[PDB]
């Protein structure tokens, strides 16, 4: 709150812009002499004599400059004078430079030296250069110069393998190192907020012709540099700035502006450094006289040209493309007439080069007229090849007199000897007037006088008007001061910075102005900028003036609603109009106009008028002279121009229409105006489109999008779409149009019929081709009801057309529009990008759409091309048969009970777990307390995450221990992480203090059964408890449990939810058989339908407590921030600053958790938060302890970056970190030492920590399998929001959710409101049905139908039938659908040979079904095994086969991982045949080969390898079973060897010594071979700790002896049973489990005793066991005849290599 004054900006602004002079006088050098010709005044400024070298100045040969930089300098012997003074500064220092030189001084090679300096850092090994490690930006003021420089730098840097490209005219430019472009282009790019995607890699910025600061375009430069500098401060990344300027006053302020050290990087060269000394002639015209003004100019021109009439070149600059033809024509038109003036400057009156200029005449246009006589023309466009030919022919210095336009001076380098500029008057469309030419143009033009290698002295002449034009004299003689035009453009600039989020308020804006050139200029010339010496003395830093300017601009932006700004706080709030305004580069008055006139019902007439009213056009007016032509155009343009007579408005309208109709024009001012309106047209219309699209106005969205496309394609909607193909003849198309036939119908005609219909058969084939090149999409929909208000839509987009790289490029963009029945409203919309490589792949787009209870017949889904005209597909979505679900019952009302005390629990040993922490239970806990603690009946508690639902389950547990001391309780959590957290908490709370037994179920079965036996409290995930309790008939400990607790039961609606549902239903089923109730306690998030889950689990209406999300003990303040960006990387980057703003606004001093999509995003967001904080001049602001205190803990960290961020008070959490590291970060965060932690989404279940503020960065994650982004499960988000809960510390929790705009409303709905859930079990049926058939719970079809009655599914099917695709809620429909389900499931199971179906009723388990059910493996997996396995299968084939298991289907493919898997593919022993690298099976294969080969990989691949190796064993054992069941010897035992070598990480053929720890590839050389051989270990390297590991290895590794007998050798014979008895004994007590350090989940040894014939390759008998101490093994098999043959007895492990044994017998 500081005093603010409203300024009048029009008072402070410089009106003349570039034409403005701070100059009082102008001092003329040496000979000033004036010659008065009475028709004009002539002022001569002579050339400066060439300066002799100074004492230290010398030329610097290319050999002297650095080795790596010599390339690109071929063609240049040594450096230029200027460049020689600059070479050390450019190449050998990183200092910011400002180079002031005469125009044409060759400042270019200096910039190239700066570039080469940047390149020199990247030298690398023998990679030659690093293309992707850096980017360089070259900003040039003119487009022509941009292309010239792209060419030059391209040629010069070609040897370094570097791409130079032009950005000004859409992504893909990401592959380009040097981006050349205009200030406004780069400003537009860096405004986007995803700017960082471009600028993160930028190490260098070169501002060319920076004196443009004085020009009206200058503020753009100021904004650019300000933005970049603040970015140097904010990112801490150093970015070098090189300014290049003409020699003019104030340049030192430019150096300051650019952060240049005046004693280091500032270089100024006066006019004596001009490469060709210039004799200057300044002509000016006395009076305004009529039309003889022009004849005066031409008379001047003639007299001054003729002084050169032998070898000399003259270049004349004129202001119109017509004036080129008129002036070159005019001297030949004038002159000659008098004694053939200057005739034959064609050298020899014969044919020297005359034959060459007369031979090129066979060119076109007016070129042919002037060319035989040394003459030519250069003007803007309309020539082609001819412009080039004028250039090359003028270049060999034959064309003598060349008349041109400034575009030549800017576009290509061809200096002449003499340069004449005519009149200095140019038409300005934006001013709508005729004004005096821009300073930059004059400089670059006159800069062409004299030829560097061909001229000792140059000459130039500037003809102009007399008055107040001493200005030019000021300009060329280095006296014209550079000022700041910033005051003019201040509101649009300020708005841009507000939209980027760089200024959040007035103070930030003042500080922002501090970086502007305006600031310095105001400081050093205060009177000029309208500041009193008094004001300046009292306020040297100009706080008052900056604050006042900011105040005025803010009021302007606030008026037009680009920004909400309150004068009290001074804070800025971005609006959408401002956001679009900054993005689409529109002035604030125009956005306000649009805001006024835009409405859904706006007609097209009205639209064109609104476009005409854009303030970009405010100075355009209708001249008398153009009226007639306008009239003609209006008669020819299609859209009615409403009641506007010839106003500026109507003129603009018709000019745009005329541009679309491609009508040719004559009037030149009119042509200029049209170009001006059409350049802006696309942007303005795209802006309008964005406005109405995001307001959801369907008609106007349609109109506006079409208008964008029409301006782009220069055609009306009415015409034929084929026009959009540019290589097609236009009269063919007009013939097609003349036929009043639909374009669509052309799809169904063969090319014969095509050529036939058009009576032009010759084109018939080609047309056909293009017809099928036209983008076309097929649309398929799948509709699932969610709530009465909400529907789920799966939209399948199928491309139908041929892709062409020429036509479609790399991609094609579409808008998915979901509109209501009237097509007046867009209910949902999103951007869909079809990539070329991924075309022909099917695209599944999922979203939700709102509906309203008086349901319409249908909605409409239109997919419309973003570019192509008349490209669309519309699909009706029919509601006729739609059955909305039942509305949700009210939540259980939360009563305010007295906050029941801990003493209400009556036990002391119980109360001691609580009283220390809290005096009382919360309202939810007290309300449910009586029910849960006192009764035994089943109970459901719904409540938001963080309501403390946990200790209700704990009430129940305490009661179970109260009733029976030996009682057994099983607790299930969907997530393993949660399971371990609960395990820690309750191990302390029960096993330690209350001294009960607390166990945690693991992967392995046997040890788990044991844990089930001893445990009082048993913690498990659904899968473990599933593979356990499947055998429940046979396992008593499963049958008897007093208490069953399920937490987060709403996860039944998520992935893996079917298993939760199955085990819960099985527990209910079990409960009814023993008529001893198994109590069931279910905890959940607020459910829209509690009632269904309650009926399912046996909860009474009173024992069911389901609470609304607003009763959450810590009240939630939820804020949802939409971002409209369709490209995720860009969105994240645009989210970076809003995150920091969220921290500092909502939780400045209190803890903050920030969830981000991926591992890498954790580090990046942490670093952004860090550096931004520090750039607020507040560092450690997030560190609430002293750095000194942290050092002792941080000494234990391996990770460097984690140390640095923790040191700044910000930690982060991802899976790559060690448990120690994670625990460290969590402990520090909980303690309050660090205020901020940034965790990946995968850890949201695995974090025990809480915050005051939770920020969710984006909502989506990348799926590499489908090549698309997918939404966070609503469950993960619920969890994340729950992590901001702090009942003790905070009076409120706070959450800020950041997301793509299309998702925004979704989170406003299902966060605030309770969550509807459904059962996906019906798609998971097969494994469970197979399982229950094996255990004989299901013996027939009726048993399956009955089994289904225990599921949540059964309940939901009548509540939301259409979700499960039931067409009715009648009991008939239910029975029918269920029967259909069991029939299909059982059928699929029979076809897979898992089960056998008998008598159409009964079912029985088969072998494969038993195998799958036993090892807990998907049935398709073992089916696949049975199909792909044969007698000749070996190890490699086995790996390929096991890699294809369905268990590995969910192995993730991450972003940009295809390259890494491609690299891994060549590094592995078994090359894979035609692999797809987004295929998870290919990945698991490669990773298996990697694990075997001891390849260490990236962290991600390592975690993946872990998840694979997890399920590897059961898969392999399944292969063993299957192989033996088919009677194959060789493939078996190979499977076993594979099990071994998977456990111990070794290959087929390999050292057995590789199993011992602390062995490398170097050691084996001296080992020349068995753990059995281990005479002094002194053979090689030993450490006593390493000695401990090896000695520990050998006392475990099996030492086993085996006896065998064929019982009664002789009494067995012909046909009868044979029993081979084997006896196993080991000479050591087994200690510890298997040790396989490289195996993630340590397994226990098991052994196969196999009997088989090695000749016929038959496995006659097999058995698997665990040894214990010693073991008896009975192998029984049937005998062949003539009883005596040769057999083999194998003894194999699943773990170790080398323990394998063979015994031959008979």
Ligand X SMILES: O=C1Nc2cc(=O)n(Cc3ccccc3)cc2CN1c1cccc(OCc2ccccc2)c1
Tokens representing 1052? 């039944």
Instruction: Check residue 1298 for interaction with ligand X (CB under 6 A).
Output: no
Instruction: Choose, by CB under 6 A, the member of 1309, 1454, 1476, 1663 that binds ligand X.
Output: 1309
**949 annotated to a ligand binding site:** yes
Report the C-alpha gap between 194 and 1130 in whole angstroms: 4
CA dihedral 565, 566, 569, 572 (to 10 degrees): -10
Q: How far is the CB of 938 from ligand X (least distance, A)?
A: 24
Query: Which run of H or of E encompasses 476?
Result: helix 470-476
CB atoms within 10 A of CB 367: 21
> For ligand X, which is the closer residue by CB, 1113 or 1273?
1273
Stretch that binds ligand X, among 204-212, 518-526, 1303-1311, 1653-1661 (CB under 6 A): 1303-1311
Report the C-alpha gap between 556 and 554 in whole angstroms: 5
Q: How far is the CB of 1280 from ligand X (least distance, A)?
A: 13
**107 annotated to a ligand binding site:** yes
- Are 1088 and 1316 in contact, with CB atoms under 8 Å apart? yes
> For ligand X, which is the closer residue by CB, 550 or 1256?
1256
Beta-carbon contacts of residue 265 (< 8 Å; ≥ 6 apart) = 89, 93, 95, 96, 97, 98, 255
Residue 725, burial from CB neighbour count under 10 angstroms (0-12, 13-18, 19+): middle
> For ligand X, which is the closer residue by CB, 940 or 1347?
940
Instruction: Check residue 1302 for interaction with ligand X (CB under 6 A).
Output: yes
Report the C-alpha gap between 438 and 216 in whole angstroms: 9
Stretch that binds ligand X, among 138-146, 1209-1217, 1233-1241, 1309-1317 (CB under 6 A): 1309-1317
Instruction: Check residue 1310 for interaction with ligand X (CB under 6 A).
Output: yes
> For ligand X, which is the closer residue by CB, 617 or 847?
847
Q: Taking Cα atoms as reference points, which of 1438, 1624, 1445, 1638 lies closest to residue 1537?
A: 1438
Q: How far is the CB of 792 from ligand X (least distance, A)?
A: 7
Q: How far is the CB of 1258 from ligand X (least distance, A)?
A: 11
Q: How far is the CB of 1300 from ligand X (least distance, A)?
A: 8
Cα separation values, 1082 from 693, 1000, 1058, 1224, 1682, Å = 45, 19, 16, 33, 67
Instruction: Check residue 1315 for interaction with ligand X (CB under 6 A).
Output: yes
**945 annotated to a ligand binding site:** yes
Instruction: Choose, by CB under 6 A, the member of 136, 1274, 1324, 1490 that binds ligand X.
Output: 1274
**106 annotated to a ligand binding site:** yes
Report the C-alpha gap between 312 and 610 in whole angstroms: 55
Instruction: Choose, by CB under 6 A, the member of 237, 347, 1305, 1644 that binds ligand X.
Output: 1305
Instruction: Choose, by CB under 6 A, the member of 1306, 1329, 1477, 1639 that binds ligand X.
Output: 1306
Instruction: Check residue 1204 for interaction with ligand X (CB under 6 A).
Output: no
**703 annotated to a ligand binding site:** no
**103 annotated to a ligand binding site:** yes
Q: How far is the CB of 1316 from ligand X (least distance, A)?
A: 6
Long-range contacts of 1-6 (CB under 8 A, 24+ apart): 1/568, 1/569, 1/570, 2/543, 2/547, 3/544, 4/506, 4/547, 4/548, 4/551, 4/567, 5/544, 5/548, 5/551, 6/548, 6/551, 6/552, 6/555
- Give the E-state strand segments of 609-733 in sequence order: none
The count of residues interacting with ligand X (CB under 6 A) is 18
Ranges within 134-193 binding ligand X (CB under 6 A): none
Instruction: Check residue 1313 for interaction with ligand X (CB under 6 A).
Output: no
Stretch that binds ligand X, among 500-508, 697-705, 1302-1310, 1504-1512 (CB under 6 A): 1302-1310
Instruction: Check residue 848 for interaction with ligand X (CB under 6 A).
Output: yes
- Rg over alpha carbons for the chain, rounded to the nearest Å, is 42
Ranges within 810-829 binding ligand X (CB under 6 A): none
Report the C-alpha gap between 301 and 327 in whole angstroms: 10
Stretch that binds ligand X, among 538-546, 1224-1232, 1304-1312, 1350-1358 (CB under 6 A): 1304-1312
Instruction: Choose, by CB under 6 A, the member of 1271, 1313, 1440, 1700 that binds ligand X.
Output: 1271
Report the C-alpha gap between 1253 and 1256 in whole angstroms: 10
> For ligand X, which is the closer residue by CB, 597 or 827?
827
> For ligand X, which is the closer residue by CB, 839 or 845?
845
Instruction: Choose, by CB under 6 A, the member of 517, 594, 847, 1364 that binds ligand X.
Output: 847
Q: How far is CA 1409 from the centre of its chain?
A: 45
Report the C-alpha gap between 138 and 1356 in whole angstroms: 63
Stretch that binds ligand X, among 123-131, 371-379, 847-855, 1436-1444 (CB under 6 A): 847-855
Stretch that binds ligand X, among 244-252, 633-641, 728-736, 1269-1277 (CB under 6 A): 1269-1277
Instruction: Choose, by CB under 6 A, the member of 974, 1316, 1409, 1646 that binds ligand X.
Output: 1316
Ranges within 1035-1064 binding ligand X (CB under 6 A): 1053
Stretch that binds ligand X, among 606-614, 1224-1232, 1270-1278, 1435-1443 (CB under 6 A): 1270-1278
Q: Which residues pair with 697 in a beta bridge?
A: 825
- Are 1376 and 1365 in contact, with CB atoms under 8 Å apart? no
Give me the 1621-1650 binding string for ligand X, x by CB under 6 A, dash otherwise: ------------------------------
Beta-carbon contacts of residue 364 (< 8 Å; ≥ 6 apart) = 386
Closest residue to ligand X in the complex (CB): 848
Ranges within 771-790 binding ligand X (CB under 6 A): 790
**1302 annotated to a ligand binding site:** no
Query: Which run of H or of E encompasses 1058?
Result: helix 1057-1074
**839 annotated to a ligand binding site:** no
Report the C-alpha gap between 301 and 323 in whole angstroms: 14
Q: What is the residue whose two structure tokens read 């036996």?
A: 1013
> For ligand X, which is the closer residue by CB, 1058 or 1316?
1316
> For ligand X, which is the closer residue by CB, 560 or 1259?
1259
> For ligand X, which is the closer residue by CB, 849 or 1513?
849
Q: Taking Cα atoms as reference points, which of 1523, 1511, 1293 lies closest to residue 1417?
A: 1511
Q: How far is the CB of 1092 from ligand X (least distance, A)?
A: 14
Instruction: Choose, by CB under 6 A, the member of 85, 703, 1286, 1303 that binds ligand X.
Output: 1303
**650 annotated to a ligand binding site:** no
Q: How far is the CB of 1688 from ligand X (least distance, A)?
A: 57
**873 annotated to a ligand binding site:** no
Q: How far is the CB of 1297 from ligand X (least distance, A)?
A: 10
Alpha helices in 619-667 (DSSP H): 627-636, 648-660
Instruction: Check residue 888 for interaction with ligand X (CB under 6 A).
Output: no
**943 annotated to a ligand binding site:** yes
Cα-Cα-Cα-Cα dihedral sign, residues 1322, 1323, 1324, 1330: positive
**449 annotated to a ligand binding site:** no
Q: Which residues pair with 35 in a beta bridge?
A: 42
Three-state DSSP class for residue 438: coil
Q: How far is the CB of 848 from ligand X (least distance, A)?
A: 3
Report the C-alpha gap between 612 and 1031 in whole angstroms: 79
Stretch that binds ligand X, among 3-11, 932-940, 1125-1133, 1297-1305 (CB under 6 A): 1297-1305
- Are 1530 and 1688 in contact, with CB atoms under 8 Å apart? no
Q: How far is CA 233 from the centre of its chain?
A: 25
Binding residues for ligand X, rule: CB under 6 A, are 790, 847-848, 850, 1053, 1259, 1271, 1273-1274, 1302-1303, 1305-1306, 1309-1310, 1315-1317
Binding-site residue numbers for ATP are 101-108, 943-950
Annotated binding-site members: 101-108, 943-950
């Amino acid at each position: 709150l500081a005093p603010r004054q409203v300024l009048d900006l029009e008072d402070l602004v410089f009106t003349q812009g570039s034409h403005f002079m701070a100059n009082k006088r102008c001092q003329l050098p040496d000979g000033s002499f004036r010659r008065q010709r009475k028709g004009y005044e002539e002022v001569h400024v002579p050339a400066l004599k060439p300066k002799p070298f100074g004492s230290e100045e010398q030329l610097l040969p290319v050999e002297k400059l650095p080795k790596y930089a010599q390339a690109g300098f071929e063609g240049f012997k040594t450096l230029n004078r200027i460049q020689s003074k600059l070479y050390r500064a450019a190449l050998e220092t990183d200092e910011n430079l400002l180079l002031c030189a005469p125009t044409g001084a060759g400042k270019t090679n200096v910039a190239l030296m700066c570039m080469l300096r940047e390149i020199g850092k990247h030298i690398n090994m023998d990679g030659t250069i690093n293309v992707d490690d850096f980017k360089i930006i070259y900003i040039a003021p003119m487009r022509s110069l941009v292309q010239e420089m792209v060419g030059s730098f391209g040629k010069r840097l070609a040897t370094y393998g570097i791409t130079v490209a032009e950005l000004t005219g859409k992504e893909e430019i990401s592959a380009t190192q040097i981006i050349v472009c205009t200030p406004e282009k780069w400003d537009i790019i860096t405004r986007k907020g995803g700017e960082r995607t471009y600028t993160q890699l930028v190490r260098l910025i070169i501002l060319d012709e920076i004196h443009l600061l004085h020009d009206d375009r200058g503020p753009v430069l100021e904004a650019l540099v300000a933005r970049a500098i603040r970015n140097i401060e904010m990112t801490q990344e150093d970015v070098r700035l090189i300014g290049l300027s003409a020699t003019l006053p104030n340049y030192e302020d430019v150096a300051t502006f650019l952060r240049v050290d005046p004693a280091k990087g500032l270089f100024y060269f006066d006019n004596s450094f001009r490469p060709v000394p210039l004799e200057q002639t300044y002509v000016g015209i006395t009076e305004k006289k009529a039309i003889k003004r022009f004849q005066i100019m031409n008379e001047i021109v003639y007299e001054k040209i003729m002084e050169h009439a032998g070898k000399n070149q003259v270049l004349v600059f004129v202001h119109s493309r017509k004036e080129t033809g008129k002036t070159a024509r005019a001297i030949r038109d004038m002159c000659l007439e008098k004694d053939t003036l200057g005739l034959f400057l064609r050298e020899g009156s014969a044919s020297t080069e005359v034959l060459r200029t007369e031979a090129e005449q066979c060119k076109n246009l007016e070129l042919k007229d002037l060319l035989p006589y040394g003459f030519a023309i250069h003007h803007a466009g309309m020539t082609r090849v001819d412009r080039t030919l004028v250039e090359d022919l003028f270049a060999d210095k034959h064309i003598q007199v060349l008349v041109s336009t400034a575009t030549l001076a800017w576009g290509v380098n061809l200096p002449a000897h003499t340069v004449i500029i005519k009149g200095t008057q140019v038409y300005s469309p934006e001013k709508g007037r005729w004004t005096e030419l821009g300073a930059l143009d004059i400089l670059q033009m006159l800069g062409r006088a004299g030829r560097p290698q061909y001229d000792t002295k140059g000459e130039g002449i500037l003809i102009t008007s007399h008055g107040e034009l001493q200005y030019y004299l000021s300009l060329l003689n280095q006296q014209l001061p550079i000022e700041s035009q910033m005051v003019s453009k201040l509101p649009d600039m300020l708005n841009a910075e507000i939209v980027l989020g760089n200024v959040q308020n007035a103070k930030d804006a003042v500080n922002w102005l501090g970086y502007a050139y305006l600031y310095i200029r105001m400081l050093r010339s205060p009177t000029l900028y309208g500041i009193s010496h008094d004001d300046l003395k009292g306020d040297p830093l100009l706080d008052q003036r900056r604050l006042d300017l900011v105040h005025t601009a803010a009021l302007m932006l606030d008026k037009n609603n680009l920004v909400k700004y309150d004068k009290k706080t001074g804070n800025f709030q971005v609006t959408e109009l401002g956001r679009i305004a900054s993005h689409y580069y529109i002035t604030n008055d125009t956005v306000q106009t649009y805001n006024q006139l835009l409405k859904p019902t706006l007609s097209e007439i009205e639209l064109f008028r609104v476009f005409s009213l854009s303030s970009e056009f405010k100075n355009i007016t209708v001249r008398e002279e153009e009226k007639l032509e306008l009239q003609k155009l209006l008669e020819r343009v299609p859209i009615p121009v409403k009641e506007s007579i010839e106003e500026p408005s109507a003129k603009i309208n018709v000019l745009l229409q005329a541009f679309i109709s491609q009508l040719k024009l004559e009037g030149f001012a009119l042509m200029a105006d049209m170009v001006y309106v059409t350049q802006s047209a696309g942007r303005l219309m795209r802006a309008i489109f964005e406005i109405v699209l995001n307001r959801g106005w369907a008609q106007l969205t349609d109109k506006t999008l079409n208008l964008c496309k029409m301006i782009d394609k220069r055609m009306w909607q009415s015409m034929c779409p084929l026009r959009q193909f540019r290589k097609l003849p236009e009269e063919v198309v007009k013939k097609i149009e003349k036929k009043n036939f639909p374009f669509e119908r052309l799809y169904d005609l063969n090319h014969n019929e095509i050529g036939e219909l058009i009576r032009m058969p010759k084109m018939g084939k080609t047309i056909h081709k293009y017809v099928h090149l036209f983008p076309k999409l097929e649309l398929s929909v799948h509709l699932q009801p969610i709530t009465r208000s909400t529907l789920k839509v799966e939209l399948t987009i199928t491309p139908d057309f041929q892709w062409d790289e020429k036509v479609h490029g790399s991609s094609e963009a579409f808008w998915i529009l979901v509109e209501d029945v009237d097509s007046e409203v867009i209910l949902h919309h999103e951007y869909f990008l079809l990539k070329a490589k991924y075309a022909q792949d099917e695209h599944l787009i999922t979203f939700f759409v709102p509906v309203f209870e008086p349901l319409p017949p249908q909605y409409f889904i239109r997919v419309v091309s973003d570019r192509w005209l008349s490209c669309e597909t519309q699909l009706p979505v029919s509601f006729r048969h739609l059955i909305l679900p039942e509305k949700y019952p009210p939540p259980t009302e939360l009563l305010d009970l007295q906050p029941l005390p801990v003493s209400a629990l009556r036990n002391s040993a119980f109360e001691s777990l609580y009283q220390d922490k809290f005096p009382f239970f919360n309202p939810i806990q007290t309300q449910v307390f009586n029910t849960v603690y006192n009764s035994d009946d089943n109970v459901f508690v719904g409540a938001p995450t963080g309501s403390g639902k946990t200790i209700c389950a704990e009430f129940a547990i305490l009661r179970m221990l109260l009733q029976s001391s030996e009682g057994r309780c099983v607790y299930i959590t969907p997530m393993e992480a949660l399971a371990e957290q609960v395990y820690m908490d309750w191990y302390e709370k029960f096993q330690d203090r209350l001294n009960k037994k607390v166990v945690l179920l693991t992967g392995e079965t046997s040890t788990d059964l044991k844990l089930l036996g001893k445990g009082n409290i048993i913690i498990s995930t659904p899968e473990k408890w599933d593979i356990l309790s499947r055998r429940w008939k046979q396992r008593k400990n499963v049958q008897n449990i007093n208490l069953f607790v399920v937490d987060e039961v709403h996860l039944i609606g998520g992935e893996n939810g079917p298993v939760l549902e199955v085990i819960c239903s099985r527990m209910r089923y079990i409960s009814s058989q023993i008529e001893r109730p198994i109590r069931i306690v279910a905890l959940s998030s607020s459910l829209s339908n509690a009632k269904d889950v309650a009926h399912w689990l046996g909860c009474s209406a009173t024992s069911t407590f389901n609470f609304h999300p607003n009763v959450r003990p810590v009240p939630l303040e939820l804020h949802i921030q939409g971002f409209n960006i369709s490209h995720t990387q860009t969105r994240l980057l645009s989210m970076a600053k809003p995150v920091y703003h969220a921290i500092t606004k909502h939780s400045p001093k209190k803890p903050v958790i920030v969830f981000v999509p991926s591992r890498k995003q954790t580090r990046l967001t942490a670093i952004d938060i860090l550096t931004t904080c520090a750039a607020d001049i507040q560092r450690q602001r997030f560190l609430h302890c002293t750095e000194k205190d942290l050092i002792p803990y941080l000494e234990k960290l391996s990770d460097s970056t984690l140390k640095e961020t923790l040191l700044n008070g910000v930690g982060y959490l991802h899976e790559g970190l060690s448990p120690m590291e994670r625990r460290l970060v969590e402990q520090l965060f909980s303690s309050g030492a660090i205020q901020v932690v940034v965790a990946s989404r995968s850890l949201c279940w695995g974090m025990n920590v809480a915050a005051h503020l939770v920020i969710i960065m984006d909502t989506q994650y990348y799926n590499g399998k489908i090549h698309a982004y997918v939404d966070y499960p609503i469950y993960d988000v619920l969890q994340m929001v729950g992590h901001a809960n702090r009942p003790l510390q905070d009076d409120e929790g706070r959450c800020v959710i950041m997301c793509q705009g299309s998702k925004k409303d979704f989170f406003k709905k299902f966060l605030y409101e309770p969550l509807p859930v459904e059962s996906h079990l019906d798609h998971c049926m097969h494994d469970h049905f197979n399982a229950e058939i094996v255990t004989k719970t299901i013996e027939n079809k009726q048993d399956a139908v009955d089994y289904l009655t225990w599921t949540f599914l059964y309940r939901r099917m009548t509540q939301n039938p259409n979700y499960y695709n039931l067409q009715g809620i009648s009991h008939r429909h239910l029975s029918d659908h269920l029967s259909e389900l069991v029939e299909q499931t059982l059928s699929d199971l029979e076809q897979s040979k898992c089960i056998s179906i008998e008598d159409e009723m009964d079912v029985a388990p088969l072998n494969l079904g038993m195998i799958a059910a036993y090892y807990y493996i998907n049935y398709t997996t073992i089916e696949l095994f049975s199909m792909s396995l044969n007698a000749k299968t070996k190890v490699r084939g086995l790996i390929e086969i096991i890699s294809n298991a369905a268990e590995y289907e969910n192995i993730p493919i991450r972003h940009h991982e295809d390259n890494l898997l491609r690299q891994l593919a060549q590094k592995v022993p078994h090359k894979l045949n035609n692999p797809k690298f987004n295929d998870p099976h290919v990945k698991t294969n490669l990773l298996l080969q990697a694990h075997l080969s001891r390849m260490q990989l990236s962290a991600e691949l390592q975690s993946d390898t872990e998840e694979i190796l997890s399920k590897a064993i059961r898969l392999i054992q399944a292969c063993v079973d299957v192989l033996s069941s088919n009677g194959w010897l060789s493939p078996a035992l190979a499977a076993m060897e594979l099990a071994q070598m998977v456990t111990q990480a070794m290959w087929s053929k390999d050292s057995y010594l590789k199993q011992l720890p602390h062995f490398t590839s170097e050691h084996i050389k001296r080992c020349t071979e068995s753990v059995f051989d281990i005479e002094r270990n002194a053979l090689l390297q030993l450490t006593d700790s390493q000695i401990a590991d090896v000695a520990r290895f050998c006392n475990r590794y099996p030492n086993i002896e085996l006896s065998y007998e064929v019982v009664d050798k002789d009494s067995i014979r012909s046909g009868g049973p044979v029993v081979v008895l084997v006896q196993l004994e080991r000479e050591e007590e087994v200690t510890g489990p298997v040790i396989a350090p490289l195996f993630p989940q340590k397994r226990e040894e098991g052994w196969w005793v196999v009997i088989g014939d090695a000749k016929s390759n038959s496995l006659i008998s097999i058995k698997r066991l665990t040894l214990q101490q010693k073991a008896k093994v009975k192998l029984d098999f049937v005998a062949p005849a003539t009883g005596a043959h040769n057999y083999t007895l194998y003894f194999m492990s699943d773990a170790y290599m080398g323990c394998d044994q063979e015994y031959k017998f008979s």
